[PDB]
Amino acid sequence: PYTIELIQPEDGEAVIAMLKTFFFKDDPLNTFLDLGECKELEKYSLKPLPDNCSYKAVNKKGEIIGVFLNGLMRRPSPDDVPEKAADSCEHPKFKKILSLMDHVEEQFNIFDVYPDEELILDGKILSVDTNYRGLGIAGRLTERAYEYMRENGINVYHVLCSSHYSARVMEKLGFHEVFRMQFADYKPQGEVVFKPAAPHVGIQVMAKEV
Ligand SMILES: CC(C)(COP(=O)(O)OP(=O)(O)OC[C@H]1O[C@@H](n2cnc3c(N)ncnc32)[C@H](O)[C@@H]1OP(=O)(O)O)[C@@H](O)C(=O)NCCC(=O)NCCS
Ligand SMILES: CC(=O)NCCc1ccccc1
């Protein structure tokens, strides 16, 4: 038995402890790179918390067994200066992940898909404790975000998935692909950067209109 609760920034340490145990070690990109200690990813993960739309799954003992960290994304201003997230990163392995993210954003803008939308919910970090996987926790974390969206007049939930495996979970939850890129085709400087196992395939950006 578990609950789904809003994460407070004072939960930051417990969220990071959980992510270090699971996500830092078992997201397909993190594990491919053997990420290790990564304070930049800790910083990245804590950033969306004050947006007040991130959720934790908590077991009967009060331990965090899952999180979905979300941030609000606003349509770029007409005079927007696009910045590469990778430019502010010192960690070489995480920089590769940020560079991949920058590349996706250079190729695909979710706001082009939804010209009328000013604000979109962005699902940034999804992680469930191994012993609690396959129980629908990812779905219940996601569903709680629908409540936030309803309350705040947000229509679109956008989630960049790091593998076809997790994209399939989002499909089950009613999301559909809006962009994809195979790892085999991601060659920023002429050569492949990510070579995880074949079934991962590549990134898929998933979206749902609620
Ligand atoms: C992706 C992830 C959050 C899914 O969470 P979840 O709460 O287990 O989600 P679900 O319960 O819907 O299970 C998803 C699928 O995992 C598989 N599964 C079943 N039992 C499982 C288990 N004990 N362990 C792992 N996977 C299992 C099933 O294929 C299941 O689909 P199905 O129940 O519809 O048949 C989780 O696997 C995870 O933390 N992965 C590592 C980090 C990651 O990749 N995050 C997403 C980045 S986009
Ligand atoms: C929804 C979700 O969890 N996307 C993960 C992207 C990602 C971010 C940082 C490191 C590795 C991978």
UniProtKB/Swiss-Prot annotation:
- Origin superkingdom: Eukaryota
* UniProt: acetyl-CoA binding residues: L126, S127, V128, G134, L135, G136, I137, A138
Catalysis: reaction(s): a 2-arylethylamine + acetyl-CoA = an N-acetyl-2-arylethylamine + CoA + H(+); serotonin + acetyl-CoA = N-acetylserotonin + CoA + H(+); dopamine + acetyl-CoA = N-acetyldopamine + CoA + H(+); tyramine + acetyl-CoA = N-acetyltyramine + CoA + H(+)
Which body tissues produce this protein?
In the adult, expressed in the midgut portion of the thoracic segments and the frontal half of the abdomen (at protein level). Expressed in the epithelial cell layer facing the lumen of the gut (at protein level). In the brain, expressed in a sub-populations of neurons and astrocytes, and in a set of distinct stripes in the optic lobes (at protein level). Expressed mainly in serotonergic neurons but also in subsets of glutamatergic, GABAergic and cholinergic neurons (at protein level).
Location of site Might be involved in substrate binding?
Y44
Q: What's the impact of mutating C161A?
A: Does not affect catalytic activity
Subcellular location(s) per record:
Cytoplasm; Nucleus
Say which family it is in.
Answer: Belongs to the acetyltransferase family. AANAT subfamily.
Q: Which GO MF terms does the UniProt record name?
A: aralkylamine N-acetyltransferase activity; arylamine N-acetyltransferase activity; N-acetyltransferase activity
Q: What is this protein called?
A: Arylalkylamine N-acetyltransferase 1
N-acetyltransferase domain location is 126-199
User: Which keywords label this protein?
Assistant: Acyltransferase, Cytoplasm, Melatonin biosynthesis, Nucleus, Transferase
Q: Do you know what upregulates this one?
A: Expression at the transcriptional or the translational level is not regulated in a circadian fashion.
Q: Which GO terms describe its cellular component?
A: cytoplasm; nucleus
* Cytoplasm recorded as keyword: yes
Q: Which residues cross the membrane?
A: none
A Gene Ontology biological process noted in the UniProt record is: chitin-based cuticle sclerotization
Annotated effect of mutating R133A: Reduces catalytic activity
Site (Regulates binding affinity for coenzyme A (CoASH)) found at R133
**What are the residue positions of the site described as Has a role in the catalytic activity?**
D27, S162, S166
Give all cystine bridges in this chain: none
According to the UniProt entry, what is the EC number of this protein?
A: 2.3.1.87
Primary location class: cytoplasm
Its organism's taxonomic lineage begins at: Eukaryota, Metazoa, Ecdysozoa, Arthropoda, Hexapoda
What the record says about activity regulation is: Inhibited by long-chain acyl-CoA thioesters, oleoyl-CoA (an analog of acetyl-CoA) and tyrosol (an analog of tyramine).
Dependence of activity on temperature: Optimum temperature is 37 degrees Celsius. Retains 84% of activity when incubated at 4 degrees Celsius for 3 days.
* Pathway linked to the protein: Aromatic compound metabolism; melatonin biosynthesis; melatonin from serotonin: step 1/2
